[PDB]
């Protein structure tokens with residue numbers, strides 16, 4: 001009876017957020033919660049692994065199909081080396097972020113929307129972000145190499 | 159009076175001619191009636207919409223060239239499966255039927271646990287709850303609805319027996335025989351065909 | 360039951376959903392009918408493997424006038440059944456011997472005629488357990504279980520004989536001939552393709 | 562994301578209703594005995610693990626015997642030469658080997674099962690399962706016990722184990738297992754002696770039963786004397 005959909009964040013109307021079908025829908029919430037970044041109980045290294053694999057896999061494609069050597073027969077090798085170089089740059093960015101970002105105490109805790117007190121993400125720490133960066137590097141290079149393999153292997157690739 | 163035709167329903171009374179020893183027979187004849195109801199109706203409708211006998215309808219769909227049954231249904235301008243695709247396949251239909259009817263029979267008769275969670279005791283031929291989307295049993299009289307169904311059950315089984323023995327005598331089909339009997343009642347009956355010899359004598 | 364897993368049940372094991380068990384004489388009748396059916400289905404199995412004649416046509420080979428054809432029908436036989444020169448298994452000869460032997464056995468099985476043996480053999484018992492079981496297989500084996508085996512074979516073979524008679528009436532081809540046609544191509548050789556052909560009448 | 566933790570209340574698509582035991586009270590009247598129910602007739606019981614080893618070889622040999630049977634019935638190729646079809650080179654042929662297959666493993670043209678592709682999938686799938694079955698890797702299903710040949714949780718979706726008598730079903734499987742392993746041994750020895758497939762040997766033995774036996778082929782030396 002005259003249902004209103006959009007509600008404040010966790011019922012508190014004094015926080016800078018609103019819960020909408022884009023934010024708090026069950027399908028959206030389940031998808032995001034199942035992504036590796038939001039698996040806070042898992043080791044940061046393995047989350048970084050999957051992240052790197054996914055990211056390094058796709059990021060190669062723009063360099064393959066739109067790079068300077070896209071017309072040449074070496075288009076794929078150039079694009080994959082470009083992707084590997086970008087993975088190395090992003091590893092540098094991750095290393096510097098991990099060195100600088102986690103310098104404060106952050107005395108305030110974290111809870112779920114149900115109100116359950118939970119521990120902080122080990123990813124959100126200097127050494128945890130270092131492990132995540134290493135996982136990113138391994139995953140990104142493996143994903144770039146896999147993209148090269150698939151461009152050389154996949155039947156309907158052109 | 160209720161059920162004054164001949165004899166009495168299994169729910170109340172005794173058979174005039176049989177002892178009714180086993181209580182499995184009651185629900186057996188309910189299921190047999192319902193199947194016959196669908197069978198007789200099928201034989202009624204097929205030979206109207208297609209003109210083929212129900213007993214030779216099986217020959218249309220065979221493991222080779224089952225495409226004959228495609229588009230046989232009245233209206234239904236799209237065939238069962240597109241022409242030239244040859245996808246009306248006796249084995250495909252048979253397997254789909256085996257799995258669907260076998261699962262339905264297992265659910266009904268307790269070979270497998272019922273998938274649902276709402277009552278539905280095995281062996282009752284009047285479940286009601288899940289099998290009344292329209293809610294006609296609670297609105298109407300349950301007992302007399304059940305008696306009507308039984309009358310239909312026995313009527314349709316007798317009609318099916320008549321259909322099979324007509325098929326054996328005249329070799330033509332139920333509706334074509336009905337039309338021949340209607341057109342010339344004196345000159346199209348069982349005794350007339352007996353005077354012709356039933357097609358063998 | 361645990362032992363009897365077939366659709367129905369054995370008399371004394373319980374009660375059948377359809378046509379429940381009445382008189383014990385019905386159970387005796389079932390066992391004896393089975394026994395003769397086992398013999399009959401085996402005969403219809405072996406004879407046309409030996410010589411190719413369906414069992415429903417094997418009767419007319421012997422006739423009151425001529426019964427030479429039945430002689431030398433058994434495969435592997437060292438000699439003719441009666442002299443090669445003049446076979447003498449005439450239908451009357453067969454009859455006169457067989458009616459006396461079968462009538463004796465029957466009356467002595469049922470005890471309408473005084474038993475010859477009088478070895479304690481009690482008529483109206485399907486399992487005599489006397490000279491009929493010289494090996495006494497029942498004594499070593501478990502008699503309840505063995506009774507169940509006997510009844511399972513009884514019902515199977517009686518059903519097989521029903522199949523033989525109805526296959527004769529539909530296809531008039533022969534039991535093993537029907538087998539060989541079905542193994543040749545079951546999809547295109549079965550009851551329903553013979554129905555499409557019309558069972559030879561339609 | 563909030564914690565729902567509702568009640569699934571799902572039932573099996575098929576869940577066999579109680580059917581109990583369909584076997585006599587005597588369970589191994591055959592030669593020998595099931596493990597844990599008597600003394601081994603001939604060979605010594607090597608170890609407690611040997612029972613589970615027998616079960617695994619049995620199930621694998623069942624699957625192998627049925628595979629050779631169906632492959633020879635559907636293609637006519639003997640099982641011992643079916644390996645030569647899919648190779649690092651020309652594994653395209655192995656595709657269309659299933660009678661009635663709506664589609665080929667190898668679509669017409671280049672599209673095809675590669676040996677290395679098939680192999681890499683085979684290692685990654687079968688080895689994973691093999692490890693998860695045994696103490697290797699870990700246990701992804703804690704509710705089941707690694708090292709048990711009869712887990713009977715998710716591995717019996719139809720629930721025949723609980724529907725019937727469990728131990729009679731177990732011995733039934735064991736008897737099928739031993740039968741199929743001995744049949745598999747017969748198949749390999751027949752392949753060695755006659756160089757023809759199992760169903761080919763069967764057909765030769767049933768067409769003329771009196772000849773086409775061990776001793777008939779021995780009269781020719783199994784094509785070696």
Ligand code: CLA
Nearest residue numbers: 367368369370373374375378379380385386388389392517
């Ligand atoms: C002549 C043979 C014969 C006899 C005397 C019996 C007798 C019996 N059976 Mg057995 N049975 C038989 C054949 C026979 N059966 C066959 C062939 C099968 C396999 C299908 C079975 C399967 C079977 C089961 C599964 C069970 C029995 C049970 C019983 C008992 C129940 C009472 C009963 O039905 O008796 C009356 C005897 C009949 C044979 C019934 C008549 C059947 C009608 C007439 C249809 C037959 C059509 C006929 C063959 C048409 C031929 C036409 C052709 C000549 C042209 C009784 C001891 C039950 C029992 O003991 O429970 C405790 C039980 O559970 N029987």
Ligand code: CLA
Nearest residue numbers: 592593594595596601605606607611612614615739742743
């Ligand atoms: C590799 C499969 C295998 C395994 C692991 C077992 C293991 C077992 N069986 Mg089983 N069994 C098998 C095969 C096997 N059997 C087969 C095929 C049959 C049917 C013939 C049987 C029939 C059977 C019965 C009837 C009984 C057992 C029993 C047992 C147990 C006691 C025996 C033991 O521990 O020593 C196992 C030792 C061996 C398997 C070594 C034997 C090696 C010979 C020489 C065979 C080699 C095969 C072949 C020729 C190799 C070819 C090589 C190729 C290059 C050409 C144990 C669980 C008994 C039991 O449970 O006791 C309570 C019992 O009663 N089994």
Ligand SMILES: CC1=C[C@H](O)CC(C)(C)[C@H]1/C=C/C(C)=C/C=C/C(C)=C/C=C/C=C(C)/C=C/C=C(\C)CCC1=C(C)C[C@H](O)CC1(C)C
Nearest residue numbers: 173174175176190193194197200201212213215315318319
């Ligand atoms: C539609 C369709 C199209 C295709 O082309 C072919 C196809 C075959 C697939 C077909 C499908 C058909 C289907 C699914 C049919 C289902 C049929 C069924 C279940 C029939 C049951 C038929 C039952 C009979 C005869 C009963 C006889 C019994 C009698 C008289 C006894 C009466 C009796 C008793 C009991 C008690 C009294 O006091 C006294 C008396 C003695 C009177």
Ligand SMILES: CC1=C[C@H](O)CC(C)(C)[C@H]1/C=C/C(C)=C/C=C/C(C)=C/C=C/C=C(C)/C=C/C=C(\C)CCC1=C(C)C[C@H](O)CC1(C)C
Nearest residue numbers: 367375377378392395396399402403414415417517520521
């Ligand atoms: C060998 C040989 C060679 C020559 O060439 C020719 C030759 C003819 C001389 C020939 C000689 C053969 C001989 C002598 C044969 C003897 C045969 C015999 C004794 C047959 C008996 C046949 C018996 C039948 C059908 C029973 C049907 C009964 C049925 C279904 C009901 C079943 C039933 C029941 C009871 C209760 C449950 O609850 C459920 C259901 C309802 C299923």
